[PDB]
Amino acid sequence: GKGTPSFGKRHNKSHTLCNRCGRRSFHVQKKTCSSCGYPAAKTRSYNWGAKAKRRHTTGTGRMRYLKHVSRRFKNGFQTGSASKA
Amino acid sequence: AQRVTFRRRNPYNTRSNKIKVVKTPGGILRAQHVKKLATRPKCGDCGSALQGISTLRPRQYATVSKTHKTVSRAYGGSRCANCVKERIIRAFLIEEQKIVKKVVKEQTEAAK
Amino acid sequence: AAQKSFRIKQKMAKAKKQNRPLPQWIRLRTNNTIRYNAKRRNWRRTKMNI
Amino acid sequence: GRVIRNQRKGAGSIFTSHTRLRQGAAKLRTLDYAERHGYIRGIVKQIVHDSGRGAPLAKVVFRDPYKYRLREEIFIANEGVHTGQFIYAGKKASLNVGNVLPLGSVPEGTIVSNVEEKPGDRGALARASGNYVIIIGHNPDENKTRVRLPSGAKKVISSDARGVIGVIAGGGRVDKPLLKAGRAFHKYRLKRNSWPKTRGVAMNPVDHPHGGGNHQHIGKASTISRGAVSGQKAGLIAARRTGLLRGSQKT
RNA sequence: GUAAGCGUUGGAUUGUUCACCCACUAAUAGGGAACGUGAGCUGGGUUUAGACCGUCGUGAGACAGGUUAGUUUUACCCUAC
RNA sequence: UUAGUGACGCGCAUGAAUGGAUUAACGAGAUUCCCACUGUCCCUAUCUACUAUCUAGCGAAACCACAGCCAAGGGAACGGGC
RNA sequence: UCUAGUGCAGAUCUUGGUGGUAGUAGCAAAUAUUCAAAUGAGAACUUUGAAGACUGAAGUGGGGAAAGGUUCCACGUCAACAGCAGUUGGACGUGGGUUAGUCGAUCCUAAGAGAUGGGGAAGCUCCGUUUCAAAGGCCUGAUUUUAUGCAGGCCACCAUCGAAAGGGAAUCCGGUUAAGAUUCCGGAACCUGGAUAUGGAUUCUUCACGGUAACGUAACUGAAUGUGGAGACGUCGGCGCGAGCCCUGGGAGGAGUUAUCUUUUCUUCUUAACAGCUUAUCACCCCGGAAUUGGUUUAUCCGGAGAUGGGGUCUUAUGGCUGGAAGAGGCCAGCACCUUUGCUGGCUCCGGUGCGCUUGUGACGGCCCGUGAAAAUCCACAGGAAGGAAUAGUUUUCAUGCCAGGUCGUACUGAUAACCGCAGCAGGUCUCCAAGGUGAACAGCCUCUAGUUGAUAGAAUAAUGUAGAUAAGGGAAGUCGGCAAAAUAGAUCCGUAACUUCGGGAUAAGGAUUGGCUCUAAGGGUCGGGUACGAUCAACUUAGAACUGGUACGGACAAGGGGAAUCUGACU
RNA sequence: GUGGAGGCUCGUAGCGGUUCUGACGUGCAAAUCGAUCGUCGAAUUUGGGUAUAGGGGCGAAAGACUAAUCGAACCAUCUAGU
RNA sequence: GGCGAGAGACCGAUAGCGAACAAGUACAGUGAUGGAAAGAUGAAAAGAACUUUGAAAAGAGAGUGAAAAAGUACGUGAAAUU
RNA sequence: AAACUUUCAACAACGGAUCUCUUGGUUCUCGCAUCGAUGAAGAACGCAGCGAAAUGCGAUACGUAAUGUGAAUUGCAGAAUUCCGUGAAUCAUCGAAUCUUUGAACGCACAUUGCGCCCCUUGGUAUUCCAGGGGGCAUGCCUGUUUGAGCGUCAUUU
């Protein structure tokens, strides 16, 4: 009964949600995410996990500041305001 | 022959989930959770229950009064009366015997 | 379960607010390529995995 | 080939000691000033059973000389000790059972236990049930005391080293058979995970050096050198002789 | 000799084919058909994996050497009947 | 009675903690015999229920070069085709 | 002219699509459905009613943990799903719904995980968790530029995380909704924290009296520090006690049956959390001084280390009376109305039994080379810093009074349809409550409350199957092999071999009996006696005798085949 | 007589999984169904928490188990490996 | 790679980035990781008024449109198969 | 002879090839150098008169302000003074702001929407208790300040 009845015995989550990635990879008994490396400082990445990088990298989100960075570089990082020509 | 339920979310028969069946004014049964029972205080010396002390859980030993937790005797709600008697006697007697040892050494050392 | 956590309940509420069909005025709008919802989710078929 | 049982035993996730019900470490009082210049009285308040240990223990209580305080210690009880019993520890103490005299203070043929081999270790040699150390003689000049240890061995320690007088309680424990895998089971249930024991010769050769074959047999010899390594050491390590003991040890 | 028309057994032991005895019989003849016949059976034997003995081998392991335990699938199609 | 049991023993190649010999009790262990019991068999028959069957509705799969009558011949030495 | 990703029949080729097989196999476990009405276009299945059946309290019942996530409830509604159907649905669409000081989390720590200091490591990071570290905050205040320093004093654990089943402060009844409730409404309580006033108590003997004592009380100072207890604990056995359930007698009510019989069959007669007055086995005290030894348990332990005895103190588990509380709730009757619809009356009483069931508990015993968590938290005690009365003080562990009590969860299933198994899978998945009879028995069979009546149907009844049964005469000849099935079977009485580690073997083997009815006998409790008995009460057990029957009776269910020997491993 | 021990025994639940080498074997099911069986107060059964991680663990030892995967798991890459 | 610009003897929806579309999406797996399919009505919705059969869905007419041999199962509309 | 099988064609079907398209991809070239403790990349949850998603955004929430243009957005509804104007608009540009809970994540923690300490202020007759609001408390290191410690050490006291 290594198959079906054991799958019936299967009901306790090894993994739950993580607060840095939100992916349900936070091993409770180790206290680590299997995807971001929480609660470590760094973010978990590998150059064999190219797809993983591509999935979790810059630009898959809002870039709440970084789009405006390039706009602002174009305008030369200016202070002040307009003058009502 | 009505059958009843744990009145809470713990379904296992542990010491903190003792129930007692009871018949209510509806004519019906209900399960009524009973708290664990208190164990009497003991004398620190012999290890025996001591009397004139209420039997309670230890924060009910806060809400109750000094009359329930104590007796009118020295070493009141802490030691047995007989152990008290014993140590009183022992105190008196070995103090006297220390006096006697002192004077024996006194007279001996003074003679020699 | 009954004894649950607020995060779970939060995600559940969000799911419940997602689980309903398209608006037909969105079906009416200009240049529209949507006919139906395809992020639709039913407890019998697929689980959230939370 | 695999790593074998004796090698897994050293990481020890499951092989660690089951150390719950043990009342504490059974060490002697510390050797501060009162012990090494006079004596001091405590009282055996209660004898109890230590789990995993066949020799009982004796919750003794002393007084702190430096503070209104009641530092309680744990001693291994010798045969004859009882409750309410005054224990005298120190140098000018008297030679009766339960006292903690030093070996320069005891004479020859004296019978002690829970002895130190280095003063200040707070308890060592002769800690198990039924066992004792025998004083042999002295060399006060070069203050050293010869002692016979239960192995049958001879050792030379500081005469300033301590030791309780008498023999440890619980003696005659192994004079009785168990009859039962269950008795053994519970014993080790409280000691550690070293029970049951499978035989390498019944294992497979991936699992043990003695393993494998179309019969249970060792093949090479079961006498291994001490200059062997982890995974080679399964049998009789560094054995000088072998087989049945045909006469005196001649030690 | 013509003759295969008709028949040619029940059992003890053996996994047995083969053999060897008991007995009846009219007779207890030999063979073939993918050494007939496993989507017809059985699975006792050999012939996976567990295990034991002996001998051999330093050893893992070997043995037409013995012993014991060990999943036998599908037809509703064409044909034949 | 190639089985079983007791005995014999120049034992291919028994044998002593590679444990030897024995052994009450125990055993979903292996084996033989006896009593009872029986459709295991002589030697087969009958009954019951659900199926198969017919019908309404629903409705798959394995497989498929093309396909589907035989004999013999020869042939890659056993063919549905020649 | 140039240039290529340039031409397919194949590659068990890739992707997609389509077929024959084939309207075929097949939709068959879980004892089982039928009649009518209503709706609707349409009913084998939806709804109702009637009937027949099942699960049969170790249940297809009622509630939960993990998990699931809104399936919960309602309205509409049937294109797809519910391997037939569909007017129905865990489906589709639209909405609604989960109320806490007292239930949990939060707190505590367990196994353990893991920073700091430090040390290793090229480095990601590893070790270690009190460590070779200068590792901090607790109280009284003192001043009255003034907030909080300075006056002191105290102490040295030395992060944090870790249990929705462990420990732990405190809530119950009735009612109520489409769906929630120990949460909401009404009523009645408790706890923590913080404020504070009066009363009470106490004091001129400054911080209480009584008691021989056990110890009692409405209260009746007490810092630092320190000691002790509770928290805090295995398992089994039998005994006692209690609660609830079961059984039962009378009586007051309603329903049922009633050709006949039946003072009959069924059912309601209930009382919470909390508070007060009382109540216990154990234990302890006083008087007293035991052999002719006595007391006493089911179980044999206790006594000059002071028994029996007489008298008394305590623990309040637990019960009883009262309050809460009859005003609720329940059972009935009567009179009213489109109706919101009620309105008014009565009863709601007194008991008995038991190796009964479950459970809790108490005192004992037995087992161990096994002696069966910790911490938080709380309390008490020793001690005596300090502080206070008299024309007035001190106390707030006594009573009363005041305020507040957050955050998150809370619906529902918990499984032959809500979890996991690709699914509406005969699988698997932790647990609590548990009626009557038979019977040793939460065995099997039947039934009540509660719940289901679901699994594609109809007509026929061939072979073959699967599952279940029987078969003369024989009785393992069958077969590798007695595989399979059969016989045996419970209980009482009798009888019991070899061998043996002397404990067993042994239900050895092997035999007899067993129903129903009418009788008998024996086995018990409570009360009565100046300083041999008698009256009353009530149980199930055992043995026996007549009578009887189509020699039947552990009448169904349930329920061992045995013996002689060997090889082997001692056993579980 | 009492008493009520035991890794005792019969035998429910429960845990298991002997035999039928039964059913099913394009199944109810990627190991189930039915009967027959073993054990059933202990080396018992079991939930939750916790530790052990791949030449590593764990193993009353079968080369067994380590997420339907084990005589060395799974994922990706080296890798369009030869 | 990022930001911004331009180009091509390149691919032209089984091609070209896995992704011309609500694509690192749905979905699977405990998890690491894995990882799709899916473009076109018509110039313009003018997306079929109204009648009739039917319980309705739909049908037959009507009508729009250049065209319903363009009717959201929409450009054309092959083959297998029917 | 039908039926049936097969073949061919017409029409209808299944199905989605072929053809023709194309806000995409790929490759080459050119140019520029710009994330973050002043809190990034990313994640979670949430915001629209009527949205699930995408894109946008953060309780000032498909956006505010400011600037420029110059009267639309559009599926519906609504709005109109907003039209010879400090002014429409899912507009473009963007220099001022908001920037939930998180995250290097920084008061301590975390499977808890958990538990604290300090300052200011308000209420509850309150330094202490409760609640509300505002502001704050990470670590290592640098320079500097203040307070220190140590017979490590100097001088000078009487």
PDB file of all heavy atoms in Angstrom, chain E residues 13-14 18 34, chain F residues 1-2 15 68 78:
ATOM      1  P     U E  13       0.864 -42.734  -2.464  1.00  0.00           P
ATOM      2  OP1   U E  13       0.741 -41.990  -1.188  1.00  0.00           O
ATOM      3  OP2   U E  13       0.117 -42.298  -3.660  1.00  0.00           O
ATOM      4  O5'   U E  13       2.400 -42.783  -2.845  1.00  0.00           O
ATOM      5  C5'   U E  13       3.310 -43.398  -1.959  1.00  0.00           C
ATOM      6  C4'   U E  13       4.708 -43.471  -2.507  1.00  0.00           C
ATOM      7  O4'   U E  13       4.847 -44.596  -3.405  1.00  0.00           O
ATOM      8  C3'   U E  13       5.179 -42.290  -3.324  1.00  0.00           C
ATOM      9  O3'   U E  13       5.550 -41.184  -2.524  1.00  0.00           O
ATOM     10  C2'   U E  13       6.326 -42.887  -4.123  1.00  0.00           C
ATOM     11  O2'   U E  13       7.497 -42.954  -3.335  1.00  0.00           O
ATOM     12  C1'   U E  13       5.824 -44.307  -4.379  1.00  0.00           C
ATOM     13  N1    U E  13       5.225 -44.462  -5.718  1.00  0.00           N
ATOM     14  C2    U E  13       6.051 -44.759  -6.773  1.00  0.00           C
ATOM     15  O2    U E  13       7.243 -44.900  -6.646  1.00  0.00           O
ATOM     16  N3    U E  13       5.426 -44.887  -7.979  1.00  0.00           N
ATOM     17  C4    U E  13       4.084 -44.741  -8.219  1.00  0.00           C
ATOM     18  O4    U E  13       3.652 -44.885  -9.356  1.00  0.00           O
ATOM     19  C5    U E  13       3.296 -44.436  -7.075  1.00  0.00           C
ATOM     20  C6    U E  13       3.884 -44.311  -5.895  1.00  0.00           C
ATOM     21  P     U E  14       5.128 -39.698  -2.958  1.00  0.00           P
ATOM     22  OP1   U E  14       5.472 -38.794  -1.840  1.00  0.00           O
ATOM     23  OP2   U E  14       3.744 -39.706  -3.486  1.00  0.00           O
ATOM     24  O5'   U E  14       6.135 -39.366  -4.136  1.00  0.00           O
ATOM     25  C5'   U E  14       7.527 -39.440  -3.902  1.00  0.00           C
ATOM     26  C4'   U E  14       8.321 -39.484  -5.182  1.00  0.00           C
ATOM     27  O4'   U E  14       7.962 -40.657  -5.943  1.00  0.00           O
ATOM     28  C3'   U E  14       8.101 -38.334  -6.144  1.00  0.00           C
ATOM     29  O3'   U E  14       8.847 -37.182  -5.795  1.00  0.00           O
ATOM     30  C2'   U E  14       8.500 -38.928  -7.485  1.00  0.00           C
ATOM     31  O2'   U E  14       9.894 -38.822  -7.703  1.00  0.00           O
ATOM     32  C1'   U E  14       8.128 -40.402  -7.316  1.00  0.00           C
ATOM     33  N1    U E  14       6.891 -40.771  -8.032  1.00  0.00           N
ATOM     34  C2    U E  14       7.011 -41.170  -9.337  1.00  0.00           C
ATOM     35  O2    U E  14       8.069 -41.220  -9.929  1.00  0.00           O
ATOM     36  N3    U E  14       5.837 -41.497  -9.947  1.00  0.00           N
ATOM     37  C4    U E  14       4.583 -41.474  -9.395  1.00  0.00           C
ATOM     38  O4    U E  14       3.619 -41.804 -10.076  1.00  0.00           O
ATOM     39  C5    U E  14       4.544 -41.060  -8.039  1.00  0.00           C
ATOM     40  C6    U E  14       5.672 -40.732  -7.423  1.00  0.00           C
ATOM     41  P     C E  18       5.415 -42.173 -19.145  1.00  0.00           P
ATOM     42  OP1   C E  18       4.886 -42.748 -20.403  1.00  0.00           O
ATOM     43  OP2   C E  18       4.644 -42.333 -17.890  1.00  0.00           O
ATOM     44  O5'   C E  18       6.867 -42.780 -18.920  1.00  0.00           O
ATOM     45  C5'   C E  18       7.766 -42.886 -20.006  1.00  0.00           C
ATOM     46  C4'   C E  18       9.133 -43.359 -19.579  1.00  0.00           C
ATOM     47  O4'   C E  18       9.742 -42.409 -18.668  1.00  0.00           O
ATOM     48  C3'   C E  18       9.209 -44.668 -18.820  1.00  0.00           C
ATOM     49  O3'   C E  18       9.043 -45.818 -19.624  1.00  0.00           O
ATOM     50  C2'   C E  18      10.576 -44.569 -18.170  1.00  0.00           C
ATOM     51  O2'   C E  18      11.615 -44.834 -19.096  1.00  0.00           O
ATOM     52  C1'   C E  18      10.617 -43.094 -17.792  1.00  0.00           C
ATOM     53  N1    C E  18      10.170 -42.894 -16.403  1.00  0.00           N
ATOM     54  C2    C E  18      11.052 -43.209 -15.371  1.00  0.00           C
ATOM     55  O2    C E  18      12.183 -43.626 -15.654  1.00  0.00           O
ATOM     56  N3    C E  18      10.654 -43.049 -14.095  1.00  0.00           N
ATOM     57  C4    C E  18       9.429 -42.600 -13.857  1.00  0.00           C
ATOM     58  N4    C E  18       9.059 -42.442 -12.596  1.00  0.00           N
ATOM     59  C5    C E  18       8.516 -42.283 -14.888  1.00  0.00           C
ATOM     60  C6    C E  18       8.920 -42.448 -16.140  1.00  0.00           C
ATOM     61  P     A E  34       1.356 -29.719 -34.016  1.00  0.00           P
ATOM     62  OP1   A E  34       0.198 -29.978 -33.140  1.00  0.00           O
ATOM     63  OP2   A E  34       1.308 -28.600 -34.973  1.00  0.00           O
ATOM     64  O5'   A E  34       2.636 -29.570 -33.082  1.00  0.00           O
ATOM     65  C5'   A E  34       3.918 -30.004 -33.522  1.00  0.00           C
ATOM     66  C4'   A E  34       5.032 -29.179 -32.932  1.00  0.00           C
ATOM     67  O4'   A E  34       5.298 -28.060 -33.810  1.00  0.00           O
ATOM     68  C3'   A E  34       4.735 -28.571 -31.571  1.00  0.00           C
ATOM     69  O3'   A E  34       5.956 -28.373 -30.851  1.00  0.00           O
ATOM     70  C2'   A E  34       4.144 -27.229 -31.948  1.00  0.00           C
ATOM     71  O2'   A E  34       4.189 -26.261 -30.928  1.00  0.00           O
ATOM     72  C1'   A E  34       5.013 -26.854 -33.138  1.00  0.00           C
ATOM     73  N9    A E  34       4.377 -25.972 -34.105  1.00  0.00           N
ATOM     74  C8    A E  34       3.223 -26.186 -34.790  1.00  0.00           C
ATOM     75  N7    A E  34       2.890 -25.235 -35.621  1.00  0.00           N
ATOM     76  C5    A E  34       3.923 -24.333 -35.471  1.00  0.00           C
ATOM     77  C6    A E  34       4.184 -23.110 -36.074  1.00  0.00           C
ATOM     78  N6    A E  34       3.391 -22.561 -36.980  1.00  0.00           N
ATOM     79  N1    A E  34       5.301 -22.475 -35.706  1.00  0.00           N
ATOM     80  C2    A E  34       6.096 -23.029 -34.800  1.00  0.00           C
ATOM     81  N3    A E  34       5.966 -24.173 -34.164  1.00  0.00           N
ATOM     82  C4    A E  34       4.847 -24.780 -34.551  1.00  0.00           C
TER      83        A E  34
ATOM     84  P     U F   1       6.031 -52.573  -1.375  1.00  0.00           P
ATOM     85  OP1   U F   1       7.360 -53.122  -1.745  1.00  0.00           O
ATOM     86  OP2   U F   1       5.398 -52.960  -0.092  1.00  0.00           O
ATOM     87  O5'   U F   1       6.129 -50.992  -1.408  1.00  0.00           O
ATOM     88  C5'   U F   1       6.155 -50.322  -2.652  1.00  0.00           C
ATOM     89  C4'   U F   1       6.388 -48.845  -2.492  1.00  0.00           C
ATOM     90  O4'   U F   1       5.240 -48.232  -1.877  1.00  0.00           O
ATOM     91  C3'   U F   1       7.554 -48.459  -1.609  1.00  0.00           C
ATOM     92  O3'   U F   1       8.765 -48.484  -2.347  1.00  0.00           O
ATOM     93  C2'   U F   1       7.165 -47.078  -1.087  1.00  0.00           C
ATOM     94  O2'   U F   1       7.591 -46.057  -1.970  1.00  0.00           O
ATOM     95  C1'   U F   1       5.637 -47.135  -1.094  1.00  0.00           C
ATOM     96  N1    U F   1       5.026 -47.288   0.242  1.00  0.00           N
ATOM     97  C2    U F   1       4.290 -46.246   0.758  1.00  0.00           C
ATOM     98  O2    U F   1       4.134 -45.183   0.197  1.00  0.00           O
ATOM     99  N3    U F   1       3.733 -46.476   1.979  1.00  0.00           N
ATOM    100  C4    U F   1       3.819 -47.619   2.724  1.00  0.00           C
ATOM    101  O4    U F   1       3.258 -47.672   3.814  1.00  0.00           O
ATOM    102  C5    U F   1       4.584 -48.652   2.123  1.00  0.00           C
ATOM    103  C6    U F   1       5.140 -48.458   0.929  1.00  0.00           C
ATOM    104  P     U F   2      10.162 -48.024  -1.708  1.00  0.00           P
ATOM    105  OP1   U F   2      11.213 -48.851  -2.343  1.00  0.00           O
ATOM    106  OP2   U F   2      10.043 -47.989  -0.232  1.00  0.00           O
ATOM    107  O5'   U F   2      10.343 -46.530  -2.226  1.00  0.00           O
ATOM    108  C5'   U F   2      10.561 -46.251  -3.604  1.00  0.00           C
ATOM    109  C4'   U F   2      11.646 -45.222  -3.796  1.00  0.00           C
ATOM    110  O4'   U F   2      11.853 -44.965  -5.215  1.00  0.00           O
ATOM    111  C3'   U F   2      11.378 -43.861  -3.155  1.00  0.00           C
ATOM    112  O3'   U F   2      12.578 -43.359  -2.578  1.00  0.00           O
ATOM    113  C2'   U F   2      10.969 -43.003  -4.349  1.00  0.00           C
ATOM    114  O2'   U F   2      11.177 -41.621  -4.206  1.00  0.00           O
ATOM    115  C1'   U F   2      11.859 -43.571  -5.429  1.00  0.00           C
ATOM    116  N1    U F   2      11.445 -43.245  -6.798  1.00  0.00           N
ATOM    117  C2    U F   2      10.408 -43.909  -7.397  1.00  0.00           C
ATOM    118  O2    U F   2       9.795 -44.793  -6.839  1.00  0.00           O
ATOM    119  N3    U F   2      10.129 -43.495  -8.672  1.00  0.00           N
ATOM    120  C4    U F   2      10.768 -42.512  -9.384  1.00  0.00           C
ATOM    121  O4    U F   2      10.403 -42.256 -10.527  1.00  0.00           O
ATOM    122  C5    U F   2      11.831 -41.867  -8.693  1.00  0.00           C
ATOM    123  C6    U F   2      12.117 -42.250  -7.455  1.00  0.00           C
ATOM    124  P     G F  15      30.639 -30.246   8.918  1.00  0.00           P
ATOM    125  OP1   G F  15      29.979 -28.922   8.843  1.00  0.00           O
ATOM    126  OP2   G F  15      31.952 -30.471   8.274  1.00  0.00           O
ATOM    127  O5'   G F  15      30.803 -30.587  10.453  1.00  0.00           O
ATOM    128  C5'   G F  15      29.734 -30.356  11.349  1.00  0.00           C
ATOM    129  C4'   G F  15      30.096 -30.768  12.746  1.00  0.00           C
ATOM    130  O4'   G F  15      30.124 -32.213  12.840  1.00  0.00           O
ATOM    131  C3'   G F  15      31.474 -30.354  13.214  1.00  0.00           C
ATOM    132  O3'   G F  15      31.569 -29.001  13.606  1.00  0.00           O
ATOM    133  C2'   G F  15      31.745 -31.353  14.319  1.00  0.00           C
ATOM    134  O2'   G F  15      31.008 -31.036  15.479  1.00  0.00           O
ATOM    135  C1'   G F  15      31.163 -32.612  13.705  1.00  0.00           C
ATOM    136  N9    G F  15      32.165 -33.339  12.917  1.00  0.00           N
ATOM    137  C8    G F  15      32.466 -33.161  11.604  1.00  0.00           C
ATOM    138  N7    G F  15      33.406 -33.942  11.169  1.00  0.00           N
ATOM    139  C5    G F  15      33.745 -34.680  12.286  1.00  0.00           C
ATOM    140  C6    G F  15      34.704 -35.696  12.448  1.00  0.00           C
ATOM    141  O6    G F  15      35.487 -36.179  11.626  1.00  0.00           O
ATOM    142  N1    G F  15      34.708 -36.161  13.741  1.00  0.00           N
ATOM    143  C2    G F  15      33.908 -35.717  14.745  1.00  0.00           C
ATOM    144  N2    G F  15      34.096 -36.316  15.911  1.00  0.00           N
ATOM    145  N3    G F  15      33.008 -34.776  14.625  1.00  0.00           N
ATOM    146  C4    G F  15      32.991 -34.314  13.369  1.00  0.00           C
ATOM    147  P     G F  68     -11.789  -9.336 -45.603  1.00  0.00           P
ATOM    148  OP1   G F  68     -12.817  -9.099 -46.640  1.00  0.00           O
ATOM    149  OP2   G F  68     -11.963  -8.729 -44.267  1.00  0.00           O
ATOM    150  O5'   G F  68     -11.630 -10.907 -45.427  1.00  0.00           O
ATOM    151  C5'   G F  68     -11.132 -11.704 -46.495  1.00  0.00           C
ATOM    152  C4'   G F  68     -10.183 -12.766 -46.010  1.00  0.00           C
ATOM    153  O4'   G F  68      -9.296 -12.178 -45.025  1.00  0.00           O
ATOM    154  C3'   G F  68     -10.842 -13.957 -45.326  1.00  0.00           C
ATOM    155  O3'   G F  68     -10.088 -15.143 -45.568  1.00  0.00           O
ATOM    156  C2'   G F  68     -10.756 -13.589 -43.858  1.00  0.00           C
ATOM    157  O2'   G F  68     -10.775 -14.695 -42.991  1.00  0.00           O
ATOM    158  C1'   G F  68      -9.423 -12.860 -43.797  1.00  0.00           C
ATOM    159  N9    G F  68      -9.325 -11.889 -42.705  1.00  0.00           N
ATOM    160  C8    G F  68      -9.960 -10.682 -42.565  1.00  0.00           C
ATOM    161  N7    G F  68      -9.654 -10.056 -41.469  1.00  0.00           N
ATOM    162  C5    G F  68      -8.773 -10.912 -40.837  1.00  0.00           C
ATOM    163  C6    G F  68      -8.106 -10.787 -39.599  1.00  0.00           C
ATOM    164  O6    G F  68      -8.155  -9.863 -38.783  1.00  0.00           O
ATOM    165  N1    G F  68      -7.311 -11.893 -39.352  1.00  0.00           N
ATOM    166  C2    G F  68      -7.176 -12.971 -40.176  1.00  0.00           C
ATOM    167  N2    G F  68      -6.353 -13.933 -39.763  1.00  0.00           N
ATOM    168  N3    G F  68      -7.786 -13.100 -41.328  1.00  0.00           N
ATOM    169  C4    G F  68      -8.561 -12.040 -41.589  1.00  0.00           C
ATOM    170  P     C F  78       9.844 -26.736 -43.516  1.00  0.00           P
ATOM    171  OP1   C F  78      10.476 -26.433 -42.215  1.00  0.00           O
ATOM    172  OP2   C F  78       9.427 -28.118 -43.843  1.00  0.00           O
ATOM    173  O5'   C F  78       8.562 -25.814 -43.647  1.00  0.00           O
ATOM    174  C5'   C F  78       8.202 -24.954 -42.580  1.00  0.00           C
ATOM    175  C4'   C F  78       6.756 -24.538 -42.629  1.00  0.00           C
ATOM    176  O4'   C F  78       6.025 -25.350 -41.677  1.00  0.00           O
ATOM    177  C3'   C F  78       6.503 -23.096 -42.229  1.00  0.00           C
ATOM    178  O3'   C F  78       5.343 -22.589 -42.883  1.00  0.00           O
ATOM    179  C2'   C F  78       6.256 -23.209 -40.737  1.00  0.00           C
ATOM    180  O2'   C F  78       5.514 -22.154 -40.179  1.00  0.00           O
ATOM    181  C1'   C F  78       5.504 -24.535 -40.645  1.00  0.00           C
ATOM    182  N1    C F  78       5.670 -25.270 -39.375  1.00  0.00           N
ATOM    183  C2    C F  78       4.872 -26.395 -39.171  1.00  0.00           C
ATOM    184  O2    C F  78       4.066 -26.731 -40.046  1.00  0.00           O
ATOM    185  N3    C F  78       4.999 -27.106 -38.034  1.00  0.00           N
ATOM    186  C4    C F  78       5.876 -26.724 -37.118  1.00  0.00           C
ATOM    187  N4    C F  78       5.991 -27.425 -36.004  1.00  0.00           N
ATOM    188  C5    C F  78       6.697 -25.596 -37.284  1.00  0.00           C
ATOM    189  C6    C F  78       6.561 -24.912 -38.405  1.00  0.00           C
TER     190        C F  78
END
